[PDB]
Design a protein around this ligand. Structure first.
Ligand SMILES: Cn1[nH]c(-c2ccccc2)c(C(=O)c2ccc(N3CCCCC3)cc2[N+](=O)[O-])c1=O
Ligand SMILES: Cn1[nH]c(-c2ccccc2)c(C(=O)c2ccc(N3CCCCC3)cc2[N+](=O)[O-])c1=O
Ligand SMILES: [Co+2]
Ligand SMILES: [Co+2]
Lengths: 380, 380
């Protein structure tokens, strides 16, 4: 059931913003590791004396990396005279965020019809304001409300190229990397208590529960067309293996964004290219499942994947799961930085053709029982 | 003249330590960009609840990248019970350093005969103590004194693999990159006032002035065999083109390390490999000199380099200069991070064979007049 109860018109995910201490090094690492092109910049060379911001793109996926300069460069400025291109940015908030959480996501940004209306309706419905609507060059409106922890949900609306004040990067500095990643599929938060978090977010957005079918409890909030998907996890205490959600909260100093799932148009190519680079500056992946898991895949998905395509899943360590409506190919990176906090999922979905409907195949819940069972089978 | 006046026995440069906010991303970027292998680690996986430290090596060059974890992970510890592998590390100092200066060098480390004696003699001769001698696993002694700004000179002595508590990295995580870089040739600091800085450092080390032959004034301090070389720059005010040393001090929030010069055993190969990667996660280089500069190179170094080797310098944008005793090949990267502060020089020296004596060919001072003249010639 989808009650289509969004309180304002939401389009798609627009970008993800990481707060960094050095945006250059993180952006360059991510570009090489994920196959994203340097697309736009806002920094000293564009007149921004406040923050350095670099945008990476792959298809429709937009990753923004921002770090603060010395406050001394802008000590004469006031908000009416700011040279910042993102008016919500604050030196103190950014340093506080990075020192507290380490490298991580500050903003989950969605495109909406009218960011000023989205902000007003959100706050009228319980959202905690973080940055009021600001109109940039009479062309784009940006506003922010608290999502969970120190992560904000950012609303962006366009009257009619990223943001005003950003410049397109020179072709000589912009290498056309592409490993097949095309868009953000979902963004997942970890919180201490799931119930109050869902009630809060569903309260101000009108997002509905998407619904599925040890360690954690989870639920997914979804927009009207189910293209904006926001899962939230809470820990389950008292187990034998300590909850990785609890480990996250401890190392992150509280709630925050746990993983970003990036859709690939060709997950085999994406993983071939990412694994080639794991030990030369890119990203590492979680350990691969035992061969008995792939032995059991023919029995579950052998009507969706050929034997050759399943052994190709085995070569790259890809996991497969299936809903009642579609099939899911997925795999997870090791944490993106020093702390065992944020990581990336690469995903491809097959089925649910109308365009493809959102969340086709689910989020992999069935792989939990399957891997425990595969662990027992490999031991035998 | 070399009075050989070192107040204690100094061996060679040992390592350079960067203080980061995320050591993983900076280390991975530097590894790919410079061709350095991941050699050793000290982090959560090695029991260090205090800081993440990753060591990159190329030949004898050692780059260490360190970032703090949440202080909460080690709140029960005291210095006698620390799980830190570098006992001088302090969460507050590191966060203060990165928030003030951005990504940069915290420690210039030299190997000495006896770090406890080096520390004692240094402080007895005016050095400001930063961290007292500490013996690690009855095997290595580490001590630190202030050098300039928030940069420390770190003394390391070995009774007899980097430091105790560091583990060798798994072969699967350690790709044998190598672009030909072999050792640190010199490390250069920027200060507001050159005279007091030289008097201070030469005062506690016994290092002597190495001696050469607009924008800045400079002098080089050298150890007994002139293998540890520490140039220091000050700005010259009142020019037309504002002093890049002054720009450094402004963007860095004061004195600090300006550039690291890395010796290559094959500067042509190093630059071919580094330039291949500039736009795919590596390092960018300064603009190349006009063709008239290379037209003038035959007249100055045509007895040292063949015509083919000079046009190869032109392809890669390499600068050449010569002392009365040797020849210098050099080139400079753009700044390593967000701020226009620290950068890298790649260097190769030819001549001065006994082994090669330190500083053979100088540091490139003659290229200043040459490029101004090349600028005038290209315009014509
Ligand atoms: C919304 N939603 N829920 C899960 C989810 C999490 C844990 C159990 C069930 C469902 C999402 C995932 O992405 C996900 C899927 C499978 C995973 N594993 C394979 C099986 C054994 C355990 C590890 C790990 C993750 N993960 O969260 O890292 C997700 O997006
Ligand atoms: C100890 N010492 N002194 C210099 C030095 C600096 C500036 C003028 C003269 C000497 C050192 C250098 O490395 C260096 C050499 C040549 C450079 N350029 C080529 C000619 C036109 C200006 C730019 C830039 C740098 N630099 O400092 O970036 C150095 O190590
Ligand atoms: Co997921
Ligand atoms: Co130099």
């Amino acid at each position: 059931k989808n009650p289509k109860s969004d309180k304002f018109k939401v389009k798609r995910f627009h970008h993800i913003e990481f707060w960094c201490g050095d945006a250059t090094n993180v952006a360059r690492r991510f570009s090489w590791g994920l196959g994203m092109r340097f697309s736009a910049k806002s920094d000293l060379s564009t007149g921004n004396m406040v923050h350095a911001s670099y945008l990476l793109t792959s298809g429709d996926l937009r990753f923004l990396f921002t770090a603060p300069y010395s406050p001394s460069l802008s000590a004469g400025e006031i908000k009416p005279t700011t040279t910042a291109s993102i008016p919500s940015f604050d030196h103190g908030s950014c340093r506080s965020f990075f020192s507290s959480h380490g490298l991580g996501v500050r903003a989950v940004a969605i495109e909406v019809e009218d960011a000023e209306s989205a902000f007003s309706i959100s706050v009228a419905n319980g959202a905690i304001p973080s940055s009021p609507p600001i109109v940039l060059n009479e062309a784009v409106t940006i506003a922010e409300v608290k999502l969970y922890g120190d992560v904000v949900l950012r609303y962006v609306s366009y009257k009619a190229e990223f943001l005003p004040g950003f410049e397109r990067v020179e072709d000589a500095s912009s290498f056309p990397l592409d490993y097949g990643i095309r868009r953000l599929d979902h963004a997942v938060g970890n919180v201490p208590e799931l119930g109050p978090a869902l009630t809060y977010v569903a309260g101000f957005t009108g997002f509905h529960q998407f619904a599925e079918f040890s360690g954690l409890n989870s639920a997914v909030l979804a927009s009207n067309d189910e293209m904006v998907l926001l899962p939230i996890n809470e820990p389950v205490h008292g187990t034998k293996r300590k909850s990785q959600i609890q480990t996250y909260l401890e190392h992150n100093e509280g709630a925050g964004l746990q993983h970003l799932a990036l859709m690939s148009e060709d997950i085999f190519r994406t993983l071939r290219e990412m694994r080639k680079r794991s030990s030369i500056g890119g990203f590492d992946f979680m350990p691969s499942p035992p061969p008995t898991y792939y032995q059991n895949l023919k029995k579950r998905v052998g009507d969706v994947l050929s034997d050759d395509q399943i052994k190709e899943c085995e070569e790259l360590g890809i996991l497969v799961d299936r809903d009642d409506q579609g099939t899911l190919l997925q795999i997870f990176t090791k944490p993106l930085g020093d702390r065992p906090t944020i990581f990336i999922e690469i995903i491809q979905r097959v089925g649910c053709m109308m365009y493809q409907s959102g969340g086709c195949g689910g989020f992999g819940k069935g792989n939990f029982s399957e891997l425990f069972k595969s662990i027992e089978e490999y031991e035998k």
